[PDB]
Amino acid sequence: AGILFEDIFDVKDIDPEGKKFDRVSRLHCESESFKMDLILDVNIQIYPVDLGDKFRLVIASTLYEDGTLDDGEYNPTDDRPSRADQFEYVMYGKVYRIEGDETSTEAATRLSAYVSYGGLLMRLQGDANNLHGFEVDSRVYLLMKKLA
Amino acid sequence: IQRRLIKSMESVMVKYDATVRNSINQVVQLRYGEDGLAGESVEFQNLATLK
Amino acid sequence: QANQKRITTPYMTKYERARVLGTRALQIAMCAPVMVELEGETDPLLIAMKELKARKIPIIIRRYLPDGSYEDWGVDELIISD
Amino acid sequence: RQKLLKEQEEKRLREKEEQKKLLEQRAQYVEKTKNILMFT
Amino acid sequence: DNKKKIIITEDGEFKALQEWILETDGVSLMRVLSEKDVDPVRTTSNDIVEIFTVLGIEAVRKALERELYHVISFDGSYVNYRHLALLCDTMTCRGHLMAIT
Amino acid sequence: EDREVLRVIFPTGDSKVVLPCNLLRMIWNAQKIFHINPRLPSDLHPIKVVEGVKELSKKLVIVNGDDPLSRQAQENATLLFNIHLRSTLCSRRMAEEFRLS
Amino acid sequence: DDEEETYRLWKIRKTIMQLCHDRGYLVTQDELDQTLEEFKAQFGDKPSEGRPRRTDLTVLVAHNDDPTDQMFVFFPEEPKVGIKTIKVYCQRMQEENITRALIVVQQGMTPSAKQSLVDMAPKYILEQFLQQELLINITEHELVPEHVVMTKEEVTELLARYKLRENQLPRIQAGDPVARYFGIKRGQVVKIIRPSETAGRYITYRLVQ
């Protein structure tokens, strides 16, 4: 499939530290199916998000419904079936950090994957079982859709 | 002050035996900067075992 | 001085590179034979840099030591960094 | 522990060398006092 | 911390002891050093000529490096140490204080 | 031993030093060039780290010569850098911090 | 008036013992670190009346390498030492067959006495020290690096390694405080080992003048 992670999140706070940027807003959200915290930077100018909203987030390694790698190059004249068709807000970034609660001897029970979508930062932290698809310096997509 | 400093140090040079010497061939430093390294390539770092 | 043991650096200094390139460029400009092949180069400086990259400059650098002796290094014997 | 014992007896040898040097300085000071006596 | 007493604790950490220090308006380094309860190891002066007369050529080399560094860095600037070292070696390589004049 | 040598060189606890090669930046460059995974166990033998650092230290020559005087001057010229190198390219740091291959 | 006098005498003796030890003379650890109370026990705590008299403070050490190479340390009573006192000390050195001495004066030394100390050098190498400059050991100062008198073999090895003449080394005056502490004459080279913030350690070599 090419999907590293999928869950439904609920916006629990927007800009706790205050609005830092005008067109960008930080959402602190939590899901229900996996109990994962999410910090996400979104362009609220084009895709406004209100407190208490509920959305489906899908971290993917590729947009093509069939398992097929991406070249990281912009190809607007691409007629293949892309899973971005099923979502409203889509970003493209790279994983730049994977933290955990590991010790010198024990493995990590909880992980924390950090992604940068051209400067818009995301932190998806929760159980390490749900974050095996994430590897540092790896390109991913956001694929986020609002639901009622 | 600038002119005085220049005229005082103008002929001090790194020689091919890597010593720093003046025009009289007297030895000012056995190695430039005590380490024989040029000042463009060095940079700030931290000694991890000091503190 | 024993050529079997030369104490100076095995690297070409920036000043040695500068003067060797200038000298060889003047020699080329004065109709000296070129040691490397040439596609379309007509500037003596470009030809001299190509010869230095190819390690085919027929010049010996006589490095003087403070004691008065000297060490002769072929341009092909030195390590070209830049 | 056996190596600990070897290092311990080595320290004993070094302290014994300290004692032999101390008595050597005594053996030369007993010469030096007569010179200090005829000095003044 | 540049004038505090930096020691190494028994645990191996650097600790800055907050101690009394005196700053005089004149210099008699020769006499002040030889006073009871005065530290003859860290007590210094900014008069490089007295440092040369009391401690010698390498002491004045080091002190002169310190004073030039203090003059350069007081405005937050930074100069590579090899330049100060070369200037200070030029002024002290002949056994006396060679003024740049 | 290098720690005690640094402690007598820098009597104030200032680890900021000016040295040729930015070893942490080179380690980061190696991590990114070879796609080092910090979460997986490494295939670098700590004995290889020790031997490689020793051979490297032998190859960094400021003072050339096999005579004992040249040996001591070589020791002194690269002392601080070799301490920085041995404390940065340590086998433990290379095993649980940098995790290089 | 008196406790400080014995304190000064003890401090001067301590610096002299450290000096002789650094010159390579045989000094026992006991006298090398002698407490002030031990000094009072061995010499007294009333120098003003005559216990100790400075003539009792005289030191006589022997070199570690040569037991016959001894050295005196005299403590003249007069503040300004005169030529007659120098002649007396030279006479004593002739009697005891000693060739090196230190004279720790209090106030100074007369010009005739200094000229006498200078002219008869090839016979008796006897030096002049102020008690004011022996109340501290300058080699313990943080500014003073580690000085080491090199041997003629070491100096030859140095000049052969760096392939240079003695006039090309940096210099140190013969009247330098540290040169006088180590009692080094012209023609000798002193190796200075100092810490360097760029290299860790740095050895330089200064020729005595």
Q: Best residue in B12, B13, B14, B16 to probe C by mutation, most C CBs within 10 Å?
A: B16
Q: Which long-range contacts (CB under 8 A, 24 or more apart) does A81-85 make?
A: A83/A58, A83/A143, A84/A141, A84/A143
Can you give the residue ranges of every domain in chain A?
5-148
Q: How was this structure determined?
A: cryo-EM
Nearest in space to F72 (alpha carbons), one of F62, F81, F59: F62
Q: Best residue in B29, B42, B43 to probe E by mutation, most E CBs within 10 Å?
A: B29
Asked if A11 and A54 count as a contact pair (C-beta separation under 8 A), the reply is yes
Distance CA A23, CA A44 (A): 6
Task: Give me B21's structure tokens.
Answer: 């010497």
Closest residue in G to B19 (Cα) is: G162
Collapsing DSSP to helix, strand or coil, G31 comes out as: helix
Distance CA A131, CA A100 (A): 10
Positive or negative, the Cα torsion across A60, A64, A67, A72? Answer: negative
Nearest in space to A120 (alpha carbons), one of A101, A85, A144: A144
- In A15-148, which ranges are E strands? 24-31, 37-43, 54-60, 92-100, 110-117, 120-127, 139-141, 144-147
Beta partners for A116?
A94, A121
How many domains, in total, are found in chain C? 1
Q: How many CA atoms lie within 13 A of G72 on its CB side?
A: 29
Distance CA B37, CA B31 (A): 8
Closest residue in B to E101 (Cα) is: B4
Collapsing DSSP to helix, strand or coil, G66 comes out as: coil
SS (H, E, C) C32-70: CCCCCCCCCCCCHHHHHHHHHHHCCCCCEEEEECCCCCE
- The whole-angstrom distance between residue A15's C-alpha and the CA centroid of its chain comes to 17
* Domain termination site, one of G107, G136, G165: G136
Phi then psi for residue F55, to 5 deg, are -65, -40
Q: Which domain range does residue G84 map to?
A: 1-136
Phi then psi for residue A122, to 5 deg, are -135, 140
Distance CA G138, CA E40 (A): 8
Q: Which domain range does residue C27 map to?
A: 1-82
Task: Give me E64's structure tokens.
Answer: 């002169």
State whether G131 and G142 are in the same domain.
Answer: no
Distance CA E26, CA E49 (A): 13
Q: How many other C-beta atoms lie within 10 A of the C-beta of residue A66?
A: 9
State whether G107 and G181 are in the same domain.
Answer: no
Distance CA A57, CA A8 (A): 6
> At what angle are helices F46-59 and F79-88 packed, to 10 degrees?
160
Beta partners for C11?
C79
Nearest in space to B42 (alpha carbons), one of E43, F78, A57: F78
Asked if E93 and B26 count as a contact pair (C-beta separation under 8 A), the reply is yes
Nearest in space to B12 (alpha carbons), one of C15, B20, E61, G167: B20
Collapsing DSSP to helix, strand or coil, G189 comes out as: strand
Positive or negative, the Cα torsion across F3, F5, F11, F14? Answer: negative
How many domains, in total, are found in chain G? 2
Name the one residue in this structure whose structure tokens are 């005595």. Answer: G208
Closest residue in B to E7 (Cα) is: B51
Helix, strand, coil share (%) of chain C residues, nearest 5: 35, 15, 50
Collapsing DSSP to helix, strand or coil, A56 comes out as: strand
Asked if C82 and C76 count as a contact pair (C-beta separation under 8 A), the reply is no
DSSP structure class, residue A38? E
> At what angle are helices E57-73 and E81-90 packed, to 10 degrees?
140
Residue by residue, DSSP assigns E34-85 as: TSTTS-TTT---S-HHHHHHHT-HHHHHHHHHHHHHHHHHTTT----HHHHH
| E97 touching chain B per CB within 8 A | no
Task: Give me A51's structure tokens.
Answer: 């407190």
Counting beta carbons within 10 angstroms of the beta carbon of residue A30, is it exposed (0 to 12), middle (13 to 18) or buried (19 or more)? middle
| B17 touching chain F per CB within 8 A | no
Q: Give the helix/strand (H/E) hosting G154.
A: helix G152-162
Return all residues near G176 (Cβ < 8 A) that are at least 6 apart: E56, E57, E95
Name the one residue in this structure whose structure tokens are 């493995």. Answer: A107
* Domain termination site, one of G136, G167, G191: G136
Alpha carbon distances (Å) from F24 to F42, F92, G193 = 18, 15, 31
Helix, strand, coil share (%) of chain F residues, nearest 5: 55, 5, 40
- The whole-angstrom distance between residue F57's C-alpha and the CA centroid of its chain comes to 8
Distance CA E83, CA B5 (A): 12
G52 preceded by a cis bond (ω within 30 of 0): yes
Rg (CA), chain G: 19
Distance CA A110, CA A102 (A): 8
Name the one residue in this structure whose structure tokens are 């080394």. Answer: G169
Collapsing DSSP to helix, strand or coil, C72 comes out as: strand
Beta partners for A147?
A54
Residues from chain E that touch F7, judged by Cβ atoms under 8 A, are 8
Which residue in G170, G198, G202 is closest to B27 by CB distance?
A: G170
Q: How many other C-beta atoms lie within 10 A of the C-beta of residue E63?
A: 23
Q: Show me where chain E is broken: residue before each gap, C-N > 2.5 A.
A: none
Q: How many CA atoms lie within 13 A of G39 on its CB side?
A: 24
Residues from chain G that touch E44, judged by Cβ atoms under 8 A, are 142-143
Distance CA G98, CA G29 (A): 23
Nearest in space to F63 (alpha carbons), one of F78, F48, F51: F78
F65: left (phi over 0), alpha (psi -120 to 50) or beta: left
Q: How many other C-beta atoms lie within 10 A of the C-beta of residue A42?
A: 24
Counting beta carbons within 10 angstroms of the beta carbon of residue C68, is it exposed (0 to 12), middle (13 to 18) or buried (19 or more)? exposed
Q: How many other C-beta atoms lie within 10 A of the C-beta of residue F97?
A: 12
Task: Give me G9's structure tokens.
Answer: 């005498």
Total beta-carbon pairs less than 8 A apart between chain C and chain G: 6
Q: How many CA atoms lie within 13 A of E65 on its CB side?
A: 20
Nearest in space to C9 (alpha carbons), one of F66, B15, A136: B15
State whether G51 and G92 are in the same domain.
Answer: yes
Max CA separation in chain C (angstroms): 46
Return all residues near C59 (Cβ < 8 A) that are at least 6 apart: C20, C23, C24, C74, C75
Asked if A28 and A118 count as a contact pair (C-beta separation under 8 A), the reply is no
Asked if E94 and E101 count as a contact pair (C-beta separation under 8 A), the reply is no
Task: Give me G157's structure tokens.
Answer: 């090895």
**How do beta strands A92-100 and A3-14 pair?**
unpaired
Q: Which long-range contacts (CB under 8 A, 24 or more apart) does F30-34 make?
A: F30/F100, F31/F98, F31/F99, F31/F100, F32/A137, F34/F100, F34/F101
Asked if F88 and F27 count as a contact pair (C-beta separation under 8 A), the reply is yes
Burial D11-23 (b: 16+ CB within 10 A, else e): eeeeeeeeeeeee
Asked if G6 and G40 count as a contact pair (C-beta separation under 8 A), the reply is yes
Collapsing DSSP to helix, strand or coil, A29 comes out as: strand
- Provide the Cα torsion A70, A74, A76, A81; round to 10°: 10
State whether G11 and G107 are in the same domain.
Answer: yes
Burial G100-110 (b: 16+ CB within 10 A, else e): bbbbbbbeebb
Residue by residue, DSSP assigns chain B as: -HHHHHHHHTT-EE-TTS-EE-TT--EEESSGGGTT--TTT-EEEE-TTT-
Task: Give me G46's structure tokens.
Answer: 């009333």
State whether G15 and G107 are in the same domain.
Answer: yes
Nearest in space to D38 (alpha carbons), one of G93, G112, C4, A45: G93
Phi then psi for residue G81, to 5 deg, are -80, 135
Q: How many other C-beta atoms lie within 10 A of the C-beta of residue B43?
A: 12
**How do beta strands A110-117 and A120-127 pair?**
antiparallel
CA distance E50 to chain F (A): 24
Asked if G208 and G183 count as a contact pair (C-beta separation under 8 A), the reply is no
Residue by residue, DSSP assigns G85-149 as: HHHHHHHHHHHHT--EEEEEESSEE-HHHHHHHHHTTTT-EEEEEEHHHHSS-GGGSSSS-EEEE
Residues from chain A that touch F96, judged by Cβ atoms under 8 A, are 104
* Domain termination site, one of G114, G136, G158: G136
Which residue in A98, A104, A137 is closest to F39 by CB distance?
A: A98
